[PDB]
Design a binder for this molecule. Structure first.
Ligand SMILES: [Mg+2]
Ligand SMILES: [Mg+2]
Ligand SMILES: [Zn+2]
Ligand SMILES: [Zn+2]
Ligand SMILES: [Zn+2]
Ligand SMILES: [Zn+2]
Lengths: 162, 162
DNA sequence: TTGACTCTCTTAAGAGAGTCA
DNA sequence: TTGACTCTCTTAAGAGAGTCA
């Protein structure tokens, strides 16, 4: 809600609840042929999810609190960043999963960045494979690799140059 | 259904027409601090675009030919790939700009791959910066770099470990 | 047969808000 | 007040199809 104290209280209540979510160990590629371990705090698959939480989509949740007798509601991963600018360079800031695990609500696995930066981590080589993200990746992106291109650039005639 | 010969004739007429689009020389990052040059064949900003071409969206076009009294229409960048499989690993194939220049219709700047592979090229370090795409990038992706993350992973209490 | 417009849809990373009990 | 559902929207890489003369 409006006050800084109220916002800090929301963040603190969210942290306490998410901190009681099951902790699931995930072994992940780091790049460079190395492996690491992440501890994700995973929201349950079905209700009940935890105090203040409700599912608005297959992998979307919201956090809700009643403050000045009115309901305030946020996307469930946005709560750690309520005191941060909500835009950057005119682009909306989004909660971005460094662990590439939507159910995870561990704030140590989240950052706050443009949707383009967010998406791009899917292809990052990872913290031991050449990640250049200033806020470093925790793992190699799940889509990193050679791809599966069906056909490359080609022409039948002689009209084009690269 | 169109025969192989008919499809080849469509590809040939498309190439003939695109080969008359204005050819624009662009200097581009290749990765590794090297610069290179790409020659894009750019569809005009407004009508007329060229024989067979029409705009269906701000940066979307279609190619249309009438064969034996039947109107056939294709996405304007899909025509080079009409003799290729239209799916791979259960995913639809998409025309993918290696030059990242949507108006360009140079078939030497296009490949045919899943939408995920297509998107991921936006963040690739480039052919001289570590590209691992099996069908190699022509340039560093426009969104490659450290990013502009507003806030990194953080907690107020001690409920979490990474 | 052709040009120049019109409309909505797909995907996978993300969102806001309303209806009930 | 809190929980458990419902709906549609945003973005930027991509699509299909209709109307009229
Ligand atoms: Mg993400
Ligand atoms: Mg592309
Ligand atoms: Zn996690
Ligand atoms: Zn990274
Ligand atoms: Zn081009
Ligand atoms: Zn590449």
């Amino acid at each position: 809600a409006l006050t800084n104290a109220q916002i800090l209280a929301v963040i603190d209540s969210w942290e306490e609840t998410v901190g009681q979510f099951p902790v699931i160990t995930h072994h992940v590629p780091l790049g460079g042929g190395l492996q690491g371990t992440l501890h994700c705090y995973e929201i349950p698959l079905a209700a009940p999810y935890g105090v203040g939480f409700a599912k608005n989509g297959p992998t979307r949740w919201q956090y809700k609190r009643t403050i000045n007798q009115v309901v305030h509601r946020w996307g469930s991963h946005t709560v750690p960043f309520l005191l941060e600018p909500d835009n950057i360079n005119g682009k909306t800031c989004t909660a971005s999963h460094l662990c590439h695990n939507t159910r995870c609500h561990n704030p140590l696995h989240l950052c706050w960045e443009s949707l383009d930066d967010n998406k791009g981590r899917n292809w990052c080589p990872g913290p031991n494979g050449g990640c250049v993200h200033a806020v470093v990746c925790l793992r190699q992106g799940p889509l990193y690799g050679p791809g599966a291109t069906v056909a490359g650039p080609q022409q039948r005639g002689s009209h084009f140059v690269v």
